[PDB]
């Protein structure tokens, strides 16, 4: 939901603030699910540099991108379009692992869904790195909305 009466979700954004392991971790969790429908660039602007900081065991930004994927879902965010284009392509900080590959990949895959010509840079973090998650998703940015078809 949004908050109806008591806005416990929004105040949480105060508690998120820290570039440390478990704090970010479940705050990333909290704020992912906070900012589905409460979506905010801040948490990005919080996590984006933490994402630029790129430390799963400390910055926790790995899974953050996924929580970030949980923020603007189904919308074109030119920033995240560029932002992870500015991180993943850049391979910010620690990234060697297929981790910061994929934490950022699927980060774009959620947010965009249904924008038409605006969703093109989602693959840029996703189908870039060759995995079983790669050459297929190339057209999955197309079905970025349907809910009733896929058996094909």
């Amino acid at each position: 939901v949004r908050n109806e009466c008591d806005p416990a979700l929004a105040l949480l954004s105060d508690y998120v603030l820290h570039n440390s392991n478990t704090m970010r971790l479940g705050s990333i969790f909290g704020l992912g699910l906070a900012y589905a429908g409460s979506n905010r660039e801040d948490v990005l602007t919080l996590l984006l540099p933490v994402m630029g900081d790129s430390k799963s065991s400390m910055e926790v930004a790995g899974v953050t991108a996924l929580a970030c994927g949980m923020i603007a879902v189904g919308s074109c965010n030119g920033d995240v379009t560029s932002t992870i284009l500015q991180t993943i392509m850049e391979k910010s900080e620690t990234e060697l692992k297929d981790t910061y590959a994929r934490w950022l990949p699927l980060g774009l895959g959620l947010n965009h869904l249904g924008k038409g010509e605006a969703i093109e840079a989602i693959l840029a973090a996703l189908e870039v790195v060759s995995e079983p998650f790669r050459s297929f998703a190339n057209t999955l940015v197309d079905v970025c909305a349907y809910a009733g078809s896929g058996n094909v």
Binding site: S135, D142, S149, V152
Partner: protein, 380 residues
């Protein structure tokens, strides 16, 4: 069509798409495992005559061939190979390769229900007493198996259902096998008598064989009258084959060596042609009858039956139930659906009182000559 237009092109995308990477990538789940298990093996099954001691050398008759006293696999102790055990035999080497389990033929397994007949205790109106005991014979012992020990006793390990044709006995089978859980074996006596002499005996065994390896299973016999009920005898030896089959069922059903968690459900219309050896308790304890609904019952039967259709909410099934003295709950069903025709025969959604009244007078009365519920009451 625009939505439909979007539908077609969208589907064509995948169609177009799928062909793409198809070109790109051009067995091992199996061809490995196939070729893996190709260097594997076959082993002709064997039937052990028996082993010997001061050493092993197991003694065996295969099948289409003959007996070979032959060594056994190194991987199987000298115990886990009791007699009468279809084991597998290094084909050429002719030495016990691995052990196995027992035959049951393709007639006993063909009747293990797999699925389950949707017939909850909601459709079983007018039997607060019938199902009440049944649940004791079948439900409670199979599920909550504490009390019967906390106090130490035994439940009607088998139970009998009888009544004219149309009381709901087959629903109770279907009802039970539904909310039961155990293994519900549906075996009809029609199944039991075949052609060549002494053939049914194999069925009961298999039945009791398969009943056994699986603790807590419901054997159900609908139409037991078919298998065997009376023990005639004369200068013709007619219903002899079937009689034994009964004795077989009799014997294994409660005579020397316990049976186990094989609970037993028998369904008849004529509970009068049945051998005392069936009837007696031990074999068939709880004896349950399925009355021809009285007053409050049929109302539940009507309400249950009609509860699931578009009926006129003013009309009270009670009146109809009153005009139904002794008709089974089945006929009452021909009415509820009967109005359907009438209700459809004009053009209407909802039925009226008369729609039922007619049905009552249309089914019951008209289809009275037939009924057979009054000839089957005295079990003829």
């Amino acid at each position: 069509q625009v939505e439909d237009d979007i539908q077609q092109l969208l589907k064509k995308i995948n169609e177009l798409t799928g062909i793409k990477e198809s070109d790109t990538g051009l067995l091992a789940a199996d061809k490995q495992t196939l070729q893996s298990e190709q260097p594997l093996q076959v082993a002709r099954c064997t039937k052990i005559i028996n082993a010997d001691s001061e050493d092993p050398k197991y003694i065996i008759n295969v099948k289409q061939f003959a007996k070979f006293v032959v060594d056994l696999s190194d991987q199987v102790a000298p115990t886990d190979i009791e007699e009468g055990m279809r084991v597998g035999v290094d084909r050429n080497k002719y030495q016990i390769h691995i052990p196995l389990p027992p035959k049951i033929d393709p007639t006993v397994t063909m009747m293990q229900v797999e699925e389950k007949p949707d017939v909850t205790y909601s459709d079983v109106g007018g039997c607060k007493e019938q199902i009440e005991k049944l649940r004791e014979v079948v439900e409670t012992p199979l599920l909550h198996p504490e009390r019967f020990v906390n106090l130490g006793i035994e439940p009607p390990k088998g139970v009998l259902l009888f009544g004219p044709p149309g009381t709901g006995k087959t629903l109770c089978a279907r009802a039970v096998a539904n909310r039961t859980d155990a293994c519900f074996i549906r075996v009809i006596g029609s199944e039991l008598v075949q052609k060549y002499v002494g053939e049914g005996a194999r069925m009961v065994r298999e039945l009791f064989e398969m009943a056994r390896t699986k603790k807590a299973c419901l054997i159900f016999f609908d139409e037991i009258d078919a298998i065997g009920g009376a023990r005639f005898d004369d200068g013709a030896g007619g219903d002899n084959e079937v009689q034994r089959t009964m004795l077989e069922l009799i014997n294994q059903l409660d005579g020397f060596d316990p049976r186990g968690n094989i609970k037993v459900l028998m369904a008849t219309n004529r509970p009068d042609t049945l051998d005392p050896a069936l009837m007696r308790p031990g074999r068939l304890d709880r004896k349950i009858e399925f009355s021809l609904p009285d007053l409050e019952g049929r109302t539940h039967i009507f309400k249950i039956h009609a509860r699931s259709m578009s009926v006129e909410r003013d009309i009270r099934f009670e009146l109809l139930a009153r005009l139904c003295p002794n008709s089974t709950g089945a006929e009452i069903r021909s009415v509820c659906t009967e109005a359907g025709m009438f209700a459809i025969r004009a053009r209407r959604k909802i039925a009226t009182e008369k729609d039922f009244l007619e049905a009552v007078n249309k089914v019951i009365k008209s289809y009275a000559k037939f009924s057979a519920t009054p000839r089957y009451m005295t079990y003829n």
